[PDB]
Design a protein around this ligand. Structure first.
Ligand code: HEM
Ligand SMILES: [Cl-]
Length: 291
């Protein structure tokens, strides 16, 4: 299975900046979503979910084909709640119908991060929509009621090492859990929508209490009102993970650099970029364009 990246016919950087801008402006506008959290978080999650289906063994799944658009993927239980990000993007696609789905779903995540004050994430276009037959079966996304070994093992399917995993998990500083979606609840709410190394600090500084929730699942609850899933908590239980955690808790810059690299990698897994492909683009935020 090879997936070669094919630039949307005749588009350039400028073309893509526009899609970005549209997503950005819309994020700014629809600030009421989820109790005023905005769509930032959910978009980040969607980008990760259409990408985390990848299997480095046979090259199946991954962001390339925009298969989330099909029923099977779309109705994946692990995807509960993503439907809101999709609906957010809909009108956007309608405006720029030439962009492929995989490119749009992924760009939304990049836009989200950057507009949430995260680091710049270089991005490459060229994902091509593939047929319904290429939709991976459900079951490839990770479970949350596990530990460090599970996490480690899981992520290896995606080619990510310890550092990548930890860097990537720091996205958990964002948004919140919704009982109806996953069987988890909180935080008690706050929720944040600014991208910082807060996840790490919370993990190291709070006094976590293990509790069972209304859905009968365990979660770590803090007095201050925060929450952490078992997989999240596991980062402090594993010796190797813990020191990285500590490192990020101490240096937001390091965190940002590493997150950027891992996120792009995650979004590019399984794709083959021809030699003549354009380099990755770094989009300007609204603010940088005075918009
Ligand atoms: C072991 C790995 C992971 C597990 C099991 C997992 C699980 C979860 C769960 C259960 C939710 C809450 C769903 C809800 O009820 O709406 C969630 C929230 C979300 N996750 Fe993850 N996640 C992990 C990795 C990721 C990574 C790698 C990212 C992206 C880099 C991500 C970003 C998010 C974001 C931004 C939210 C907040 C969504 C919102 O506010 O609607 N998580 N994650
Ligand atoms: Cl997630």
């Amino acid at each position: 299975l090879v997936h070669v990246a094919s630039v949307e016919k005749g588009r350039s950087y400028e073309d893509f900046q526009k899609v970005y801008n549209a997503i950005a402006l819309k994020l700014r506008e629809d600030d009421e979503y989820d109790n005023y959290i905005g769509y930032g978080p959910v978009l980040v999650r969607l980008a990760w979910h259409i990408s985390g289906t990848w299997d480095k063994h046979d090259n199946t799944g991954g962001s390339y084909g925009g298969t989330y658009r099909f029923k099977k993927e779309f109705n994946d239980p692990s995807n509960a709640g993503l439907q809101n990000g999709f609906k957010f993007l809909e009108p956007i696609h309608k405006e720029f119908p030439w962009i492929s789905s995989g490119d749009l779903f992924s760009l939304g995540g990049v836009t989200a991060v950057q507009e949430m004050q995260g680091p710049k994430i270089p991005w490459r276009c060229g994902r091509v929509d593939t047929p319904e037959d290429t939709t991976p079966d459900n079951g490839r996304l990770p479970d949350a009621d596990k530990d460090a070994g599970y996490v480690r093992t899981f992520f290896q399917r995606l080619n990510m090492n310890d550092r990548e995993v930890v860097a990537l998990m720091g996205a958990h500083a964002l948004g919140k859990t919704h009982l109806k979606n996953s069987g988890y609840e909180g935080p008690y709410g706050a929720a944040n929508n600014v991208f910082t190394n807060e996840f790490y600090l919370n993990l190291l500084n709070e006094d976590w209490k293990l509790e069972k929730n209304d859905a009968n699942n365990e979660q770590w609850d803090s007095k201050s009102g925060y929450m952490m899933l078992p997989t999240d908590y596991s980062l402090i239980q594993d010796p190797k993970y813990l020191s990285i955690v500590k490192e990020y808790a101490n240096d937001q810059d390091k965190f940002f650099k590493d997150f950027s690299k891992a996120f792009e990698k995650l979004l590019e897994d399984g794709i083959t970029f021809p030699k003549d492909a354009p380099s990755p683009f770094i989009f300007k935020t609204l603010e940088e364009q005075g918009l």
